[PDB]
């Protein structure tokens with residue numbers, strides 16, 4: 001049975017091995033839609049080379065590479081198995097991985113999808129909360145692919161561009177939080193502070209209208225609602241780099257602040273990504289929770305398990321796709337509104353690519 | 360019959376008449392918890408007099424004063440009537456207004472509550488979303504009052520310190536949004552962009568861990584969920600003053616950005632306050648209308664009606680108080696966690712004041 005419906009799982013991706021680091025960075029610094037640099041074609045290769053050593057070291061510290069593809073594949077496999085039973089009218093389903101800066105690239109995935117002669121293609125972002133710098137960037141790649149190939153799609157496209165409050169996603173987070181709370185000494189469980197952590201954004205991006213912060217906040221509220229506000233919490237942000245202003249509080253400074261104020265039992269909850277990656281395995285676990293935590297004299301700091309291979313998460317993915325198919329929606333209503341201060345002409349073209357699709 | 364349960368409605372307040380402006384500003388600039396100024400006792404009076412003319416002019420433009428007390432009283436009376444019926448066991452109920460910078464001052468209300476010989480006192484903030492600079496400030500006033508007079512409370516205290524997603528509050532916002540959408544030309548309704556607007560915060564405050572942005576974001580999500588995402592939206596922020604960085608996007612810059620990009624049908628929705636005040640009647644209705652207008656001409660820009668005297672809102676207030684009474688809660692779990700980077704000694708003392716109250 002030839003594939004009928006293709007589910008393109010979009011994510012930035014991460015280098016699988018240390019040798020993949022350089023090209024990962026090179027592709028990223030060459031993404032004119034992601035950032036604008038003077039003589040970019042000359043500086044991109046240079047910046048990539050200068051950052052490679054330190055980044056390779058970070059990946060070495062976590063085993064030698066990113067586990068994103070392994071987790072994405074497991075989730076994709078599980079999603080497809082469920083879909084073939086859930087939606088027989090659109091079966092057989094096939095998942096395709098479309099990483100923005102590593103193989104398989106978004107472009108390579110689309111090429112394969114077209115070759116397979118699919119009837120429908122669904123751009124399914126793996127970021128539950130929409131940022132023009134994450135999901136937007138991947139959707140732009142799809143639009144740009146067809147414009148560069150000078151050909152129109154031979155498949156009918158649509159996108160699941162965000163899903164910050166899907167009930168099963170919320171259930172997965174709540175479940176993982178409860179199981180991690182069970183790992184704290186019973187006597188300290190009620191005193192545990194939950195720090196939801198998500199990749200930060202530069203204020204220049206937040207200030208133009210990026211919908212990310214508000215959606216991440218929505219995910220946090222739903223999770224706490226399901227947990228019946230059992231513990232106190234704060235939503236903080238990690239991964240800031242450079243001297244420019246970014247959205248705070250910073251996760252590292254918040255952990256230190258809490259410890260210095262007597263709150264030494266902390267549960268970190270990555271709330272904007274669904275698998276382990278450099279942000280959790282290195283930044284939170286090693287950079288912070290090993291150098292900071294100790295130096296601050298904390299009692300117990302743990303991190304909720306990433307969704308990774310949780311079967312319930314695969315069900316969440318399948319239900320999202322199933323509902324999307326049955327609704328006949330081309331994209332979210334939110335995608336039809338670009339940032340009030342957007343200055344990137346590709347955003348409007350990408351939005352139109354999806355809203356104009358033949359049904 | 361003598362009152363048994365007192366509900367202290369907390370809000371910053373606004374000057375009732377132009378003559379009240381000076382002292383309004385004076386009390387605000389003297390509040391060392393809200394801000395630290397060099398030789399504050401000398402500069403506070405000066406800055407107050409310096410800004411009085413400009414602020415008086417703003418109020419003159421909206422009729423001569425703030426309507427906050429009138430709306431609060433109307434809401435309070437409606438709330439009490441419902442409470443006497445909902446909770447006979449805690450009746451009679453009596454509402455008291457406790458404004459932070461204008462009469463009746465928080466301190467004056469507490470004095471009256473104690474004179475009335477109440478058995479129970481509930482600090483009910485009128486800000487659905489918690490900010491250490493709004494609700495926190497009001498709660499500090501209560502703690503400091505008893506620290507000032509030098510004597511323990513003669514009433515049993517508790518607080519409803521936040522309620523960002525109360526189901527009836529959400530219904531009120533949704534109802535008001537739908538009623539305003541019905542005022543747009545039918546052919547442009549679907550084109551209408553919803554801009555939720557809330558008072559901004561300096562980034563220095565956001566970065567220390569203020570819970571406000573995340574809670575406002577939660578309110579927005581719940582409202583859009585009830586509206587079934589009928590229109591696209593963005594949460595933006597207003598009222599920034601000074602040269603320092605504040606949380607954006609700014610509401611005015613967003614309206615201008617939208618208009619310049621073709622979205623000339625906008626619905627403004629004040630989402631962090633429940634009555635009309637300077638922010639809606641002057642800033643949104645007048646200032647923005649005059650600042651824009653030219654060149655980039657808007658087609659239709661309307662503002663959803665503030666909750667004000669909506670009887671459903673009164674029901675929301677009573678439901679909140681009733682549920683609070685039934686649960687025996689002293690405060691939200693969130694209040695038990697101060698900002699990770701809080702540097703104000705009073706915050707912890709205020710928290711303890713409420714968590715330690717005798718039942």
Ligand SMILES: C[C@H](CCC(=O)O)[C@H]1CC[C@H]2[C@@H]3[C@H](O)C[C@@H]4C[C@H](O)CC[C@]4(C)[C@H]3C[C@H](O)[C@]12C
Nearest residue numbers: 035036037038039043046047048050204242244
């Ligand atoms: C000017 C540009 C900022 C783009 C903008 O937001 O306006 C910044 C971003 C990346 C910067 C470069 C990177 O930080 C890499 C180099 C760092 C060296 O210390 C200076 C040259 C160096 C080659 C930088 C030149 C310049 O400051 C760049 C190119």
Ligand SMILES: C[C@H](CCC(=O)O)[C@H]1CC[C@H]2[C@@H]3[C@H](O)C[C@@H]4C[C@H](O)CC[C@]4(C)[C@H]3C[C@H](O)[C@]12C
Nearest residue numbers: 028034035055132133200201202205239240241
């Ligand atoms: C800040 C930006 C998202 C918002 C924006 O579009 O500006 C994000 C998207 C991808 C991120 C980059 C990638 O994660 C690759 C690098 C990871 C390193 O740990 C920091 C630098 C690094 C080069 C990151 C800088 C910055 O955090 C990026 C560029």
Ligand SMILES: C[C@H](CCC(=O)O)[C@H]1CC[C@H]2[C@@H]3[C@H](O)C[C@@H]4C[C@H](O)CC[C@]4(C)[C@H]3C[C@H](O)[C@]12C
Nearest residue numbers: 034035036037047050051202204241242243244
């Ligand atoms: C840290 C890295 C330079 C590597 C190094 O020289 O050590 C620089 C190079 C390109 C920079 C990015 C680009 O200038 C694009 C963005 C510019 C914004 O003002 C800040 C975030 C922003 C996303 C920058 C983050 C960071 O300063 C980067 C990623």
Ligand SMILES: C[C@H](CCC(=O)O)[C@H]1CC[C@H]2[C@@H]3[C@H](O)C[C@@H]4C[C@H](O)CC[C@]4(C)[C@H]3C[C@H](O)[C@]12C
Nearest residue numbers: 393394395396397398399402403405406407409
């Ligand atoms: C130094 C202090 C900032 C303290 C803080 O971070 O809150 C700032 C806040 C308000 C400022 C004052 C107000 O802007 C009023 C005056 C404005 C004049 O241009 C200078 C003196 C003037 C009297 C200012 C002195 C100084 O810049 C102040 C006092």
Ligand SMILES: C[C@H](CCC(=O)O)[C@H]1CC[C@H]2[C@@H]3[C@H](O)C[C@@H]4C[C@H](O)CC[C@]4(C)[C@H]3C[C@H](O)[C@]12C
Nearest residue numbers: 387393394414491492559560561564598599600
């Ligand atoms: C920024 C601050 C809230 C966060 C904080 O604590 O810094 C808020 C609380 C009360 C606000 C002030 C009050 O609304 C009174 C004044 C209103 C005027 O329109 C602007 C200046 C004005 C003097 C405001 C400045 C600023 O927006 C304040 C001081």
Ligand SMILES: C[C@H](CCC(=O)O)[C@H]1CC[C@H]2[C@@H]3[C@H](O)C[C@@H]4C[C@H](O)CC[C@]4(C)[C@H]3C[C@H](O)[C@]12C
Nearest residue numbers: 393394395406409410561563600601602603604
């Ligand atoms: C606008 C007003 C008066 C300026 C002047 O008339 O010269 C000034 C005086 C006190 C200032 C505030 C105080 O300095 C306290 C805060 C300091 C933060 O860095 C910005 C917001 C902040 C809340 C300030 C907002 C604004 O600059 C204020 C409210």
Ligand code: FES
Nearest residue numbers: 132338339342347
């Ligand atoms: S930057 Fe957000 S739509 Fe373009």
Ligand code: FES
Nearest residue numbers: 491697698701706
């Ligand atoms: S400033 Fe937020 S608790 Fe003190």
Ligand SMILES: [Cl-]
Nearest residue numbers: 014066277278
């Ligand atoms: Cl990674």
Ligand SMILES: [Cl-]
Nearest residue numbers: 373425636637
């Ligand atoms: Cl007012």
